[PDB]
Amino acid sequence: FEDESAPITAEDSWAVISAFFREKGLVSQQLDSFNQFVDYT
Structure with a gap:
């Protein structure tokens, strides 16, 4: 059903936000x- 090229909505913003914290963390700056x-x- 998905076009794999349709524009994203505001719900996908939280999906984008996820996997950023999973990669960095809340204390990423100090450790880095x-x-x-x-x-x-």
Whole structure:
């Protein structure tokens, strides 16, 4: 039924928001900064 090219609605915004937190987390900035520091600086 899906066209695989139809424009997304406001409901798909939450689907887009998901898999972003699943990848980064709420404390992603601190962990990324510390890892980069330890690895390079």
